[PDB]
Amino acid sequence: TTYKAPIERPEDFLKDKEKAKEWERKEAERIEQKLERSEKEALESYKKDSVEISKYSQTRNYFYDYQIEANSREKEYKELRNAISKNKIDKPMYVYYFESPEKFAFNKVIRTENQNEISLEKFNEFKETIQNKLFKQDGFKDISLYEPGKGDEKPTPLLMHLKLPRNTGMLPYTNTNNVSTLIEQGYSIKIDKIVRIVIDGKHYIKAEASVVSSLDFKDDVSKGDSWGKANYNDWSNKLTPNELADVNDYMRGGYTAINNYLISNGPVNNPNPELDSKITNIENALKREPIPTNLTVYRRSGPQEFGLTLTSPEYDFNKLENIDAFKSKWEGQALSYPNFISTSIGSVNMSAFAKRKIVLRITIPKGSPGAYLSAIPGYAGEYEVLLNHGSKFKINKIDSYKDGTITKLIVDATLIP
């Protein structure tokens, strides 16, 4: 039943640097024979501009489809992405890399770079920050295949020991006299265990991390639409006529009256049985065929969703103090929506919400209520997934990016069951 690999390796090289580097060099030479000339050229460009190429691969998919196509960095992105995808690994591989604790919204400082010790207080604070959370990792990154020792670069107090699952793209390559391994990331990680370790008198937190598989179509709306239609083409027929009629009414513009009623706390202030009945039916419809796999969706959120307005000075994310204030208020916090929440399987910008500065990137766990409404023909919504009213979201991490000269935010959140 097991595939025999061309160059044998264990799942983890552990502290064995010599054996890891030997394997990595042999793999780099082996995979080089599978690469196309345009793929080899993309790898050469990568070594001369890795920082900018990596930053581009993190946020390229948030633009309009025509902007992605027109971007001068897109050709290089596609070629380097294809190169890594030429070596999907046959069995899991544990990798190692140093990470900033800020990557997990930990701002209390594990220890300063010049400091040695890690207090029990900071270790416990870090544990409570990362426990029971998923964190999206995205973009090109170089990783190591063995545990660092004395002679190795250790730029932070946090060491990631991450299990890459089978079929993850991994590209070992040569760079002048050295060898490195490139991955594209693009998955959720969970930190299962943290331990204090000592390397040459200095203390580090070693984080045992694993990938929690999910669908994330990003700018590939065609692939997302195929998945949505494969799972929800027969959804309309699973509903009662009243449920289907209320879902249809909502989709055709009834969402304004229903959601305004929910936002205004209408069930408490002025109960409307006709609106309550529609809400009941739509909620039931969303529970008929739960989201069948962990799924990432994207919502271009209005400032009112985060207690701001279009003219609020706090909504100007071009100022670093406004980003820091937003992160302080929302990172690690829960956000509950009284209304139904429309999202898209695509991360691309859309003309209807062109100027919205907040991109809510939601991971929906398997079994959540929801439905791919765009499986119903002739609908305005773009590749739409509707989430149930009253949904709660845990905000895990917030990032920023530039959309032209306007700074926008990416809010990495998880739907709570």
Ligand X SMILES: S=C(NCc1ccco1)Nc1ccccc1Cl
**Contacting positions for ligand X (CB under 6 A):** 96-98, 142-144, 146, 148, 152-153, 155, 159, 180
- Measured from the CB of residue 156, what is the shortest distance to ligand X in angstroms? 8
Rounded to whole angstroms, the Cα distance separating 311 from 278 reads: 34
Nearer to ligand X, 148 or 370 (CB): 148
Rounded to whole angstroms, the Cα distance separating 169 from 185 reads: 9
- Measured from the CB of residue 146, what is the shortest distance to ligand X in angstroms? 6
- Measured from the CB of residue 5, what is the shortest distance to ligand X in angstroms? 22
Nearer to ligand X, 158 or 285 (CB): 158
Q: CA triplet 358, 186, 294: central angle to 5 degrees?
A: 80
Contact present, 173 and 15 (Cβ < 8 Å): no
Query: What is the distance of C-alpha 232 from the center of its chain?
Result: 24
**Residue nearest ligand X (C-beta atom):** 144
Nearer to ligand X, 153 or 274 (CB): 153
- Measured from the CB of residue 179, what is the shortest distance to ligand X in angstroms? 10
- Measured from the CB of residue 105, what is the shortest distance to ligand X in angstroms? 20
Nearer to ligand X, 96 or 326 (CB): 96
- Measured from the CB of residue 113, what is the shortest distance to ligand X in angstroms? 13
Contact present, 372 and 382 (Cβ < 8 Å): no
Residues 6+ apart with CB under 8 A from 29: none
Lookup: tokens for 391 = 């949904």
Rounded to whole angstroms, the Cα distance separating 263 from 278 reads: 15
- Measured from the CB of residue 30, what is the shortest distance to ligand X in angstroms? 20
Nearer to ligand X, 159 or 275 (CB): 159
Rounded to whole angstroms, the Cα distance separating 140 from 129 reads: 25
Nearer to ligand X, 152 or 314 (CB): 152
- Measured from the CB of residue 208, what is the shortest distance to ligand X in angstroms? 14
CA dihedral 82, 85, 87, 92 (to 10 degrees): 160
Nearer to ligand X, 61 or 180 (CB): 180
User: Cβ of 238: how many Cβ atoms within 10 Å?
Assistant: 13
In three-state secondary structure terms, 381 is coil
Nearer to ligand X, 78 or 154 (CB): 154
Strand order across the 295-301 sheet: 334-336, 392-403, 406-415, 358-364, 295-301, 341-344, 384-387, 371-372
Name the strand (E) or helix (H) holding 371.
strand 371-372
